[PDB]
Amino acid sequence: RGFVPQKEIVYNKLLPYAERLDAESDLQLAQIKCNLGRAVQLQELWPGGLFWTRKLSTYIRLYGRKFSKEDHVLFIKLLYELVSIPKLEISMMQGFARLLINLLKKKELLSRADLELPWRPLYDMVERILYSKTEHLGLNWFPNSVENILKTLVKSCRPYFPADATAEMLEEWRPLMCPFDVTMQKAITYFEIFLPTSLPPELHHKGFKLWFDELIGLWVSVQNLPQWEGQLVNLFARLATDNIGYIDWDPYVPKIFTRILRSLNLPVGSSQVLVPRFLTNAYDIGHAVIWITAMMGGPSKLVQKHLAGLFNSITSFYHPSNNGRWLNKLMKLLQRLPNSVVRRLHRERYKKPSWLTPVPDSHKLTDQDVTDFVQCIIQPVLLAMFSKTGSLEAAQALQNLALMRPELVIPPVLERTYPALETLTEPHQLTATLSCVIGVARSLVSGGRWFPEGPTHMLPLLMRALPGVDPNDFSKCMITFQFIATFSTLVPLVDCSSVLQERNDLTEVERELCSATAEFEDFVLQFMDRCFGLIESSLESLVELGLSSTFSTILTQCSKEIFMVALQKVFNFSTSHIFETRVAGRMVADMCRAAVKCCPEESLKLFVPHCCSVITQLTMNDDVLNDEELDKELLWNLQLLSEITRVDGRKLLLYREQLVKILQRTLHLTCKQGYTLSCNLLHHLLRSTTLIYPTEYCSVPGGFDKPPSEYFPIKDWGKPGDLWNLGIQWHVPSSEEVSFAFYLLDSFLQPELVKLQHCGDGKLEMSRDDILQSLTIVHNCILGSGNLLPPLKGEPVTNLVPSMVSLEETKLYTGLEYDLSRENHREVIATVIRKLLNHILDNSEDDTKSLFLIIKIIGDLLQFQGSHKHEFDSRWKSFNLVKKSMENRLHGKKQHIRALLIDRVMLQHELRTLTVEGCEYKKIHQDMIRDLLRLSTSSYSQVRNKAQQTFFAALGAYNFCCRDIIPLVLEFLRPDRQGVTQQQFKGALYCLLGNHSGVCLANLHDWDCIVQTWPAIVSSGLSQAMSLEKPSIVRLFDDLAEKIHRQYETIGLDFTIPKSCVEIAELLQQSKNPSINQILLSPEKIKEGIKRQQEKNADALRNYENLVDTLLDGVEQRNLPWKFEHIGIGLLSLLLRDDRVLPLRAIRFFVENLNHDAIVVRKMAISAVAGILKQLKRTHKKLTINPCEISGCPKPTQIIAGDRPDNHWLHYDSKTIPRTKKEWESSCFVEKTHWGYYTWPKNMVVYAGVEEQPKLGRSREDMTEAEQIIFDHFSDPKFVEQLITFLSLEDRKGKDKFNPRRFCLFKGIFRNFDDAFLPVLKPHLEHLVADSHESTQRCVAEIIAGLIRGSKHWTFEKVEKLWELLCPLLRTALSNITVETYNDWGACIATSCESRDPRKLHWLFELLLESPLSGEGGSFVDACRLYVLQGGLAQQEWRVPELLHRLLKYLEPKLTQVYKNVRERIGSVLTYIFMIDVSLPNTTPTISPHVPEFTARILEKLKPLMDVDEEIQNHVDERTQGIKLLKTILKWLMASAGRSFSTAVTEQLQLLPLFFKIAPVENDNSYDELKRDAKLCLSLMSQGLLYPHQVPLVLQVLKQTARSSSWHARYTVLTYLQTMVFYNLFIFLNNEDAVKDIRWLVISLLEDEQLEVREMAATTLSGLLQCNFLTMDSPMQIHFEQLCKTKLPKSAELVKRHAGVLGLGACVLSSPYDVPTWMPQLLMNLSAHLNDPQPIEMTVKKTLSNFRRTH
Ligand SMILES: O=P(O)(O)O[C@H]1[C@H](OP(=O)(O)O)[C@@H](OP(=O)(O)O)[C@H](OP(=O)(O)OP(=O)(O)O)[C@H](OP(=O)(O)OP(=O)(O)O)[C@@H]1OP(=O)(O)O
């Protein structure tokens, strides 16, 4: 046609009316182009621009793309330039972004030659919304799902960025890469979001080869778990997948795999624990799996060797006995890894050539490369089949592993399935080995040309699973139903066993597989007695969904020969075994309609004459009409006929006459089991006759009951997909059955509609049980015949919204062609039920049953067109669960069982008939929602609750109708509307609360609906039909105020579409592939558009400043309870703008109630006034320095990090602080603590001098008149004494903190006024540091912090006057520090010098590093003043090298001289002293203290402890002070283990052999606080990453101190090696000399003189041999067996036999849950050493007991 579609939805072509969808969707696309290009040009963003955005979205939910490549680009460019507007409302930016994700989601449709989206407006967009500077002060209020929808919005646009973007993302975030602060996190989040990885290989040199070596050297050089390196592995996983025949990963793979194994955080060793170690994040296996599977392949498998080694290391932990907290993530590795290999194989093989860069032939997965993956991973998968958590994530692994290698996967799972389904003592296995045969099923039934036996296992295993259909287990009867249903769609069970005339053309498998087909009667009848007994003895509405699901699945897959036997067996059981009508007859009648739904013409012939005759014989007496019990043979046959008839309606027009006659008599029969079972008979009779649905659902198209059985149905087991030759048998309603539906509606709806219309009059005094009956008939008649009768129409409601483009409904066809010459039957029913609602709600108020049906009939007159929304939702959910469990992912043409592939076209039809867009609100619908409200606010709470759910669904159905009813919900909660009721008020505010996932009506988006609602919701506190004494009314106003504060998004006040969005929108309304011929836009109304928009964002301003004023008028209204003013202030606290300053009266309000008598309002006021002082801040001017213009040096290239010469002037040096006003005014003062560490930015800001800054010290006449209010309050003593009285008061005793909310209050005070308030404050905070209270010291710490941070932009005279004040204040405050107080001054000082220049606040450091370790106050103030100082030197990282040298020079004389609580602080402080000496790549050696230089001076001092003769542990010269030193440095290494970037440097390694001989052996019990201190330090230090150059050095240390004379030392080096290998194990496995050194070390220590170290060496040999780090050699057996034969000595002799026996025991204990081939001969050798004397006897006995307890 006129344009080329671009990946349509396939399922639109398969509809019965698919000829109509071409002419329809071309018109809708033309309207979307026209009224989106108009709407952006017009800047009608709210009613028109966001409308046709929302209608373009539902054009893609319905039709796929179906627009040109030329026109796809136009939508992308328009909604990209329009989603990135620098001050655009974030609330409606959500819709533009969600469409823009949806337009770039399928990446293969554009090609970078069609689209070149810039990256800068996305970065300015994320900075505004992820690193917002005003959200924490409460001025912005984003939606909650924003970060997750913008990180995918940038992810969507990222493959289309310009080629130069990487190089200009690396000059803008590379300056932020200082690893010591929080701005490294910002850099690596922006790299993980923005930095492009999918570029063609023609320009890899402008992509990842411009940052990769840098960023992965940065990745490898750290050993912590920073929160940014998990951001960084998310980045390399994306890089590895997109570029696979490229970056080698070969130097890196032994580090990726070993960090993944560390992330699995398996407990290894003799109870060595890691409380300190990072357990929380950084290694999701979703991305680690992706990164593993993208590295394997190519010429060097290396990656497959590591992957096999990984699963050899974890094989103990996948065993079902060994479950733990690790298992939730080890199951994730196992379920996600074969899936991602399936997706790689599909990417490489069965995915078509496209724009995306294809994988090279050199790096595709080969035959052996994927066979080796199956061979490595399957034993943990089979081991995890029997897991206690529930076998779900092993079945998915078995599904994906059987797509690639079914011959390696299926025979083990049925080797474990046939015994499991045979047993009766292990029932955990049946649920395991049947759920794991569900996923293996499509591979099992196919064969696959190398596993042909496959299917022959089907019908044996299908028959043997029949006792699972069980009344006793719900749990196995579910999986048995779900097993029989999945192994019967996969087989046409036509009896193809009468083929012995077919001497050739068959296989020896196919012959044996067709002469087993004859047992298909013996399956569908033995199955069916299992299903009869379960009914006869019948959580249970699922075992009739499963029952009727698998029985309908069976019965469409059986031939007409099998079906007649099943039909006779259904019929005799339903006919002669009379059933109760609640649970058992509900099951039989749904088993009956499976047989009726299959072959409609023969099965219906049995039931409908029988059930009509048996109902006719039992209804004959004519006193059964007014009998209110109905003897229960009529109930069952009436239920049977009721559900027998939801079938193909064309095949039921034969039984037309004598089925209306069964409705002529039973509908008016007074028993609500029996007109209900006869009106749902009427329901299922209409909707079988009216609605469009497929009829067959078979696996083989359009046939399957065919007389020639000479061809061969059992070579078709599978046949997946075939979308094109599909052949859906649709039931489209013919004119005959539409005529039957209207006759059945004119015979059973019209009389009782006349009856209810008279009942609305003064005729027909009608019973309440008779009104309910007639409404029940009307409800089921509408609810069946919905598709025929067209929806409600009428005149449009008038005064809602000016609408310059258009507001048009979507007209979707759905295949029926409404008869408009008949009287619409929705309108007459609405006419009757409105008048009957007036009758009931005025005459019979208490009719709690019919009234509900007025609610349901309003709810379906207004909504229901043939399809239920909830049923379609349930079906959709079911579809993805069935689709994912049968997903042949490897193959890529939507191959699926024809059953769910027909069900998906039916879902496309239901999605099509169910989505009706923003249709005109049309005053007949207004009366539906007026009258509904009358039910929403009614006498009974249950009719209110059910009435509000159809009310909330009525409001999301009509555009601009939430705004229509705002003042009618709000009538009842007016203060002056006299006497509404208690229940009308409670109903109006439930109505105004909404529900969890719909409209709210109290927090709608416009101004015109908040300015109404919020003053009503505060002013409903003085209402006199209002009672807070009721505990539900308090709960709802707390829910109302709680929901709005949770869901307010900032609104509007500016909408101005720029001259870039209108430029690209003119081209979209003039594109001519598809169009309606619409006129060029007149500039007369490109002037009325600006005219309407400028006055539309003018009453946004009017409504905002009106809302603030009337919240203020309401919150102080002469008698209002404290709840409502606490509500009305929090709602007012939501209105701190940042586009404007707050209203003058609200500034007055929040300032005057800082000192309010309620502490809740005081905290709201602290937050609000901090927001006010941020709104009122004067902008400080910046200049640009060249950083080689103050330093005077060439600022070299080849970018190097760390302390440089151009960096050096920015360091704190004690000889260059200004000290005068002239050296201060001529100085640079780079404030941030990261600028210039890594590199300098393109331009760099300075904060220029005071002569150009905003002038400070104003005299209140120069102030901006809202500074007047804060000045006139914060400068008088009375306000300040009340403020500091309320603000030094204890709130939560023991739970109070520093509270940075109150710090932001005083930081803004001393940032806007700065000079006059502290003379008012100096007596108050002079008094406040002298108090030995807790909360008074809290109060002054917040004021001192905000006063120090506030003095950032002051004059030298004014900061000089500030520090003459603050120095004695801080001296007194740190001398009077307390246990209740110390971590509050630690937050005061760390807060007061974060993001500040250290030279500017040098008075802190001279006060606070003078004597932290002094002695007055004793201990604990030495520890806490050295802690308060610690946060101060911690915030000023890398930039204060000396003063960290001054602290090291101060405090090396004091490591010996100090108490227990202080050397912990000494250790944490030395950790923060040596943070800056990093081994990070290309980092210049720091000016900061070096950690090797210090620990050499320690090694000098600690020398007399580590010498010969081994006497240690006295702690009572240069030896006891060495013990005292070793205490302090042991607490240092404690804190250094998890914090420093390069843990355990090469001179923090000679500290080990001295720590080995002093650590204990067995227990963690109380040993001198120096042994247990050395035990946990050793346990905490093996558990830590090593470098590859470092694993020779540590192992050289270990074999040195395993050769010592201390057996405690030789024990603990052998536990150290035990934890040190498995944590970061590969690093050692990527060293052929380290594995040999470790095996020589463990074999050597296995023959020591101490028995304990021999047992420990056996334990660690057995553990290193278990994880396969160490291989059990043939020389290893020779050495052990030649030690076993030593002699009895007639020791030096018995120790050798014990060594050899102990090594053999290590070898047989290394395989706990498996006997390998070498074990039986090896275990006979240990049997010859039982009577071998002690200690060999105990080793043999413990070894063999430990053997056979696990085998
Ligand atoms: O309509 P649904 O239910 O939301 O699900 C859609 C998905 O959502 P979307 O249409 O974008 O909203 C979309 O997947 P993503 O875009 O997220 O990747 C399609 O993938 P695509 O076809 O582009 O990708 P490929 O073909 O798998 O390579 C379809 O996934 P497959 O079945 O794997 O694809 P097949 O339809 O079988 O061809 C799937 O069609 P179904 O309706 O049958 O589930």
Ligand SMILES: O=P(O)(O)O[C@H]1[C@H](OP(=O)(O)O)[C@@H](OP(=O)(O)O)[C@H](OP(=O)(O)O)[C@@H](OP(=O)(O)O)[C@H]1OP(=O)(O)O
């Ligand atoms: O002094 P700090 O506590 O470090 O806070 C500053 C300060 O913001 P406030 O004055 O609102 O606290 C800067 O404002 P000026 O003093 O330079 O006017 C602001 O810079 P911008 O106003 O240019 O945003 C900067 O924010 P940023 O670091 O994003 O530039 C921000 O630092 P924090 O982000 O650490 O608060």
